[PDB]
Symmetry: C5
C-alpha cells in the first residue's frame, strides 16, 4: 500500500527522497591500506570530503539517504552528475550500470523476506566508484556488508591487498550472495505450500499461493535485469584493472545467472501449483459425488416402496398375502445388494 | 464502440481527421530565451509562421487538430512531407520515430483511466522538431505539459537555458512521467480486484477481470513499442546535440523500460488471477458438496427406517415387541453418530 | 473441407492450378501516362504481349488464373522462371518476396469474412514488376483495387505522375488497407462473443469461440510472415527508385506491423476468453449448489421428524402429550429459521 | 514401447544398427545420362563400387541398412568418416547437415500415419552426395522416391539433363512433399476430433486428444530442426553448382517453412482443444444441476407438507376443516407454479 | 531437504566442500601410451604430482573431493586459480566452461533416478585438462567412466592412440551418453503416469505428477545450459588440436541438443497432462451427476404421490374410486417411463 512513485511536474535536477525510511541518519568511513586500518562514524559531511584524493582505497558508507543536503554536497564535490544524484534519491528504480569517464554508478536492491508472514521488503543500494574511493548509499541501518568490514578489519583475505575496484567486487559479491539466502527462505515456503496444496488443503491456501506468485514475479523483476547489470561490467570495465577485476566479476556474473535460473525455475513450479489445487478439489468433489449418489440410489427407490405400502387404500392385497411384511423387507435387501454390485464398477462410462 | 479506422480507397496524400474530438480548436505559442519570455493564444495560422526562422527556441501548441486546413498550411510552410501530415490526422496509429534531414517526427499517446468505472481513453500526441522550433499536435484541451509551461514561465530549471532540443526532452519526459500515474491507478484497481477475487467474490467480478485484462493488453500495445521509440532516439539523434540531449534521453529511456516491465508484470498477475477465482469457486462448491452429503447420508437411511414402520401391514411385530418405539428412536441415534464419526475423516479417498 | 494441397509425384516445372475457382476467366489491361489513359478487357493472350516494352507504366490484370496456357505463355514471353510460374498456380502458399535481376515476385492474400456466419475465405494474389509493367494474378472476379483504377481513371493523385514502381506501392497499399476492414469485422464478432460469454451464455457459444480462435490463428499465419514480406522490400528495393519508392513502402510497412500487433492482441484476448466462460459456468453451478443444499437441509430433517410421527406404534406418547400436533409444527419452525440464520454465513469454510 | 536408444559403453567407431527393421536387405542402383538409362537390383556390395568414379550422375539405393558389413565396406571405399557411418546406423537421431570437402551428409525422416488408429512411425533416411554419386540408406522396403525413379525412367523432366546435385534436390523435394500428405491426414483427424469435442463427446475422447497432442509434438521435434537443415544448404552449398542447385533448394526451403508453420498452427489449436472439452462438460453438469435442483425444490417442500398430514395425532384439525383434502392439493399447486415462475430467472446471481 | 547453498560471509579464496558426501576418499591414476598401460589406487597426494610433466596422456581420478587439503595441494602444484578450485568444492553450481591459457575447466553433472520411488540425485563432476594431463573430481564412488577405463585397459578403440584431449572427448561423451539412459527411465515413468491419468486414476496420482514435473524442470535446469557448455568448446578449442578434437565434439554437441529437445518435449507433455486428469475427473462427476439426477427425478415425484395417499383425511375419494390402488401404481409407471424417454436425450441444452 501507498509508496506511490510519482515525483510528477518536477525538473530533472530535483532532489527528492521518495523512500519510506527518513527516520535515522548515519555516515561511516572505512579507509585502509596493506599497512594500516582506520574507521569512524560521524554526521559531518565535511570530514568525508578530503578523502576524495586519498591514494589509499577508501570505503564510504552513507546511511539515511533521505538527507538531500548531504547527497548534493557530496555529489557536487565529487563532480557527480545531477541526474545520477536524482536516481539515488529515487528508491523506485530498476537496477542498472551507467559508465562515466570519472566514475561508475550502480543501482542495487537488498531484500528481506519475513517469517511467519508473506511479504518482501526492498531497500535500494546505490554505489559509486571514483578514483580510489567507493561510495555506498542506503536507507536504513543494517546491511550484508558486515563480513566485508570484518575481512578488512581483521585483515582477512586479499581484500586488504588490492584496491577499491576489488572492494567494489567484494561489496557486490556480498550482496549477490545474500540472494541465495533469500531463495532458500522462499524455497522453504514453496515446499510448505506444496505440501498444503498436495495434502490437507484448506481455505486461505489459495491466497498464500497468490501472495507467493505475486512476490515471486516482483523478485524476478529485480533479479532478471540484474543479470545484464553484471553482464555490462564483465564485458566493459574501462577504468577498472583487467588483470584483477575482470576474472572475479565473472564468478559473480555466474552467480546471478544461477540465481535468475533458480527464480524462473520457481515460477514454472508455482504456475502449475494452482492447477494441482484445482485438480485435487475436483477429485474431492468427485469422491463426495460418488458417496452422495450411491446413497440416494439405494434408498430413494426403497423409500418409494415403503411409501407404496404406507399409502392407505380400500383394497390392500397385503392382508391376502401371507408373510408380506417380511418379504418386502427381503426384496428390498436384494435391491440394495445388486446396486452395490452394480457399483464398484468402471466409472467414467 | 465505433471509432472504426478505415480511410479506405484513398490516396496517400489525403488529409482526414479520424478522431472523435473535432469539437474545439486552439493554437498556443510559447517562445522563450534566457533573457525573455512570451506567449499568446490565437486562432490565426499566419501568425505562427514567421516563428519558423526564429533563433530562440519556440514551443508551438496546436489543439483541435481536426482542422485539416491548418495542418496542411503549417506542413507546407515547414516543408513537412504529406505522409507525415497524414499520419498526424490519423489518430489510430502505433507510436514511432521517423528521422529526416529537416526534422524529427514522433507519435505519442496520452492516457486517462476513469474512476468508479473501467475504461481507458487515448489521445494521440504528435510532435515535430525542426530548427529551433518544436510543434505539438493534440485533439482536445488539457495535457501533462502544464508544469513544462510553468518551469518556462517561472524560469524554473535549466529548461530556459538550453534549446528546443532539450525542450523536446522535457515534453517527452513530462509525458512518460504521466504513465507512472496511470500505472498506480491501475495498480490500485488490481489490488481491489485481487481482494474481490481472493475474498467475498460475486457476480460481475469476472467481467471486471476481463475488462482489466483487455485494457491492460491494449496498454502494453502502446507502451511496448514506445520502448523502441525512445531506443531509436537514444542511439541516433543526428541533428540533436550529443553534449546535452543524449544523456537526458537515457533517463527517459530508463523510465519507459521500468514502465514496460511494470505492465508485463501486471499481465502475469492478471493472467493467473482468473484461475484463483475458479479455484475458489470449486472450493466453495466442494464445501457445499460436503454439507449436502453429510445431511442426505444421516437422514435418508433414517427416513427409510421411519418409512418401514410407517407402512401398514396385517402383521406387525412392534405390538409384540416391548418398548419398540423408543429403541427405534435410539438405534437411529447410533446410526446418526457413527456417520459423523465416519465423517471428519480423510477426504479425497 | 477438401482443398487438399498435394501435387505429389510431380516435377518442379509442372503447371497446375490447385485452386477452387476455375469457373471464369478475364484479362484486363490499364496503360497510362501523365498525358493519356487507356484500358480494355480482352481474352486474347497475344494482345497483352507487346505492352512489355511499353515505356509508359502499364497495369496488367489477369483473372481466372486457372488457365495454365495463359500463365505459361505470359511467363515465357517475359522470361519468367518456371518455379515462379509454378508458385502462382499454387494457391496454397505462404506470402513472400523473391527478388530477381529482371523482376520482383510477390505473393499476397486477400480475405473476406462472412456475416451471420463464421468463415474466412482467402484468395491468393500474385504480382510481378518488370520494366514499366506490373502483372497481377487472381482467382475470381472482384478485388480491392477498384479505387486504384478510379484514381488512375480520374487522374486522382500522384499515381498518374509516378511510374509502375509507385503503382506497385498503390496496389500493395490498397490490399494492406483492406486488412483493417477485415479486423474491424472480426473485432465486432469478438465484442459480440465477449458479451455472450460474459452475460447470458448458452450452448454453441463454445463452438463459436473455437471457430473464432481457429480462424484467428490462420489469419496470423498469413499476416505475420507478411510483415517480413514488406520488411524485405523496405530494406532492399534494388531495381526500384530510392528517391520515391522507399519512403512510401515505409508507411505500408508501418501498417502491417500495427495489423500484426492487432491480430496478436486478439489472440491474447480470445485465449483467456474461454476461461471466462468456464469461470462463469462454475459460478452458476456454485449458485445452483447453494440453492439445492439450503433446501435439502431445511426439509430432510423436518421430513424425518414427520416420518417419526408418521410411523405407527403400539405406544404413542402423543396421546398423553397435550397440544403435541401444534408444537411439532412449531419446533420445526425454529429449526427452519436457525438454519437460514446458519445460512447467509461466510462460505468457503 | 521398447526401441530404447542406448549404445552405452561403446567407442565412437562402433557400427551398430539400432533400428527395429533388420528383416530384409536390398541394394538398387540407377545410373543415368541424357543419352542412356540403366538400373538393376543386386545384393553384391562389390558391384556398386566401381560406380564411384562414374562421370554420369548415379543414384545408389541401399535398403536394409542393418547390414553393418555393407555400410562399412561402402564407407571405406568412399573414404567416409566412421562417425558419419555411425550416425547412419543410429536410427534415433535428429536430422542434420554435415558438410565435408569430399561429400555432404544429410539425415532425414520419413513418416507414415495409420488409419483407424493413432500412431506415427518414422524411418530415418540418410543420404550422401559425393562426386557424381548420391547414396541413399533406408530401413525397410518402400519410399516416396518412386516418382523420382519414373521421371528418370521415362525421361520426364529436367532431372535427366542436370547432374546428381539436382537429383539431390529431387530426392529431398520428393520427401518434403510427402509431409504435406502427412499433414492432411493429421488435419483430418483434428477435424474429426474437434467435432467429437464440440458435439457428442464421450469416454476415450480425451485419450485420443492426448495421443494426437503427443504425436504432434514429436512431429514438430523432427520438422522444426529440418528447417535449419535446409536453411544450412540454401546459404552454403560449397560443392554444389550455384547456377542451378541454389534457386531450386529455395522452393524446398519455402516448403519446410510452410510445413513447420502448419505444424505449430495445429499445436495452438490442439492446446486449447482440451479446454473446449472441459468447458463443455462443466456446461453439461451445470445443465444437469439445474434439472436436479428445480425438481428437488418443487417436491421436497410439498413432500414435507404431505408428511405433515401423513403423521397421525390425537388432535387433527382436518376433520373440523371442510374440504381440506382438496385445498391441500390446491395450495401445493400454487407453490409448484410460483417456483417455476421463480425459475426461468436470471441465473449466476 | 537441507543441502542449503550458503557459504555466506566468506572470502572468494575460501575452500569449503558444500556437498552431502564427505564419507569416503580415493585417488586413482591411469597413465597410458600406445605402447604401455599402467594404473594404481593410492591415497597419497604426492605420488600424483610428478605426472604433471609426463609426456604420455595421463588420466587422474580423485574421488571424495571433500578433502580440501588435496584439492589445494593439487591446484597449487598445477598453478590452478583459487576461484576455479573454489568452484570445484561448491557442489551447487551451474555447469560451464572457463578457458585459460594453461588449462580448460569444465563443470558437469551426473544423475541417478530411483526406481519404485520418485527422486533425482545429482553429483557434480569437475574436470581439468592441462598439458597431457586430465583431472577428474567426484564426490562418491561410482561413475559412468568404467567403459572408458576398459577401452583403455583392453586397448579397445582409438582412445589409446590419441592424446588426453581425445580422452577428454571420451570422458564427456561417456557422461553425455548416460543422460539417454536417464531419459528412458523418466520416459517410462511418464508412460506409466500417462496410463494412470488416462485410465483408472486415483489419489496421490496428482502428487506423482507434481513430483515428475518439478524433477523434470530441475533436469532441464542442468541440461539446457549444458548445450552452451559444449557449444563453447565446439567453436573455440584454443589449446586442443583442430585436426582431431573438433569433429568428435560435434557429435557430442549433436547429442546434447537431442537430449535437450527430448527434455523440452516432455515438459510440453507433462504440462497438459494435469489438465487431462482434471478433464477426466469432471467427466466422471458429470457421469455421476446424470446418475443421481435420473434417479431423483423418477422417484421424488412418485414419492410425493405416495405421500398424498399416505396422508390421512376425513374425506378420501379412494373408497369411492374402484380399483384406485392398482391404477395409482399404474399411473406412476407411465411417469417413470416417459422420464426415461425424456432421458437418453440431447444433453448440454
Ligand atoms: Mg524527472
Ligand atoms: Mg565461484
Ligand atoms: Mg493511405
Ligand atoms: Mg532518472
Ligand atoms: Mg514441386
Ligand atoms: Mg501513414
Ligand atoms: Mg558413441
Ligand atoms: Mg514452389
Ligand atoms: Mg565467494
Ligand atoms: Mg554420432
Ligand atoms: Mg489452464
Ligand atoms: Mg408416510
Ligand atoms: Mg402413514
Amino acid at each position: 500500500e501507498k509508496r506511490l512513485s510519482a515525483k510528477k511536474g518536477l525538473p530533472p535536477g530535483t532532489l527528492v527522497y521518495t523512500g519510506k525510511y527518513r527516520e535515522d541518519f548515519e555516515i561511516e568511513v572505512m579507509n585502509y591500506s596493506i599497512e594500516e586500518f582506520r574507521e569512524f562514524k560521524t554526521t559531518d559531511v565535511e570530514s568525508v570530503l578530503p578523502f576524495r584524493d586519498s591514494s589509499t582505497p577508501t570505503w564510504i558508507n552513507i546511511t539515511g539517504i533521505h538527507r538531500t543536503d548531504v547527497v548534493q554536497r557530496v555529489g557536487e564535490f565529487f563532480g557527480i552528475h545531477p541526474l545520477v544524484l536524482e536516481d539515488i534519491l529515487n528508491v523506485h528504480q530498476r537496477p542498472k550500470v551507467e559508465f562515466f569517464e570519472n566514475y561508475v554508478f550502480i543501482v542495487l536492491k537488498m531484500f528481506t523476506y519475513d517469517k511467519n508472514l508473506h511479504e518482501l521488503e526492498s531497500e535500494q543500494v546505490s554505489l559509486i566508484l571514483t578514483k580510489n574511493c567507493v561510495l555506498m548509499f542506503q536507507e536504513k541501518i543494517g546491511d550484508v556488508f558486515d563480513p566485508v568490514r570484518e575481512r578488512i578489519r581483521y585483515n582477512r583475505g586479499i581484500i586488504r591487498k588490492k584496491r577499491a575496484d576489488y572492494l567494489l567486487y567484494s561489496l557486490i559479491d556480498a550482496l549477490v550472495d545474500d540472494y541465495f539466502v533469500l531463495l532458500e527462505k522462499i524455497d522453504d515456503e514453496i515446499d510448505v505450500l506444496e505440501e498444503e496444496v498436495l495434502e490437507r488443503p484448506e481455505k486461505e491456501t489459495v491466497q498464500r499461493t497468490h501472495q507467493l506468485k505475486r512476490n515471486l514475479v516482483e523478485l524476478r523483476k529485480t533479479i532478471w535485469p540484474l543479470r545484464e547489470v553484471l553482464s555490462s561490467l564483465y564485458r566493459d570495465v574501462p577504468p577498472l584493472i583487467e588483470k584483477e577485476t575482470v576474472p572475479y566479476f565473472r564468478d559473480v556474473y555466474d552467480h546471478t545467472i544461477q540465481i535468475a535460473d533458480t527464480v524462473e525455475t520457481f515460477r514454472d513450479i508455482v504456475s502449475g501449483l494452482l492447477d494441482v489445487y484445482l485438480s485435487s478439489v475436483s477429485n474431492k468433489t468427485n469422491e463426495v459425488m460418488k458417496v452422495l449418489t450411491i446413497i440416494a440410489t439405494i434408498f430413494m427407490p426403497l423409500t418409494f416402496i415403503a411409501g407404496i405400502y404406507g399409502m392407505n387404500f380400500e383394497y390392500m392385497p397385503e392382508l391376502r398375502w401371507k408373510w408380506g411384511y417380511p418379504v418386502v423387507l427381503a426384496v428390498m435387501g436384494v435391491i440394495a445388494v445388486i446396486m452395490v454390485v452394480y457399483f464398484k464398477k468402471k466409472k467414467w462410462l
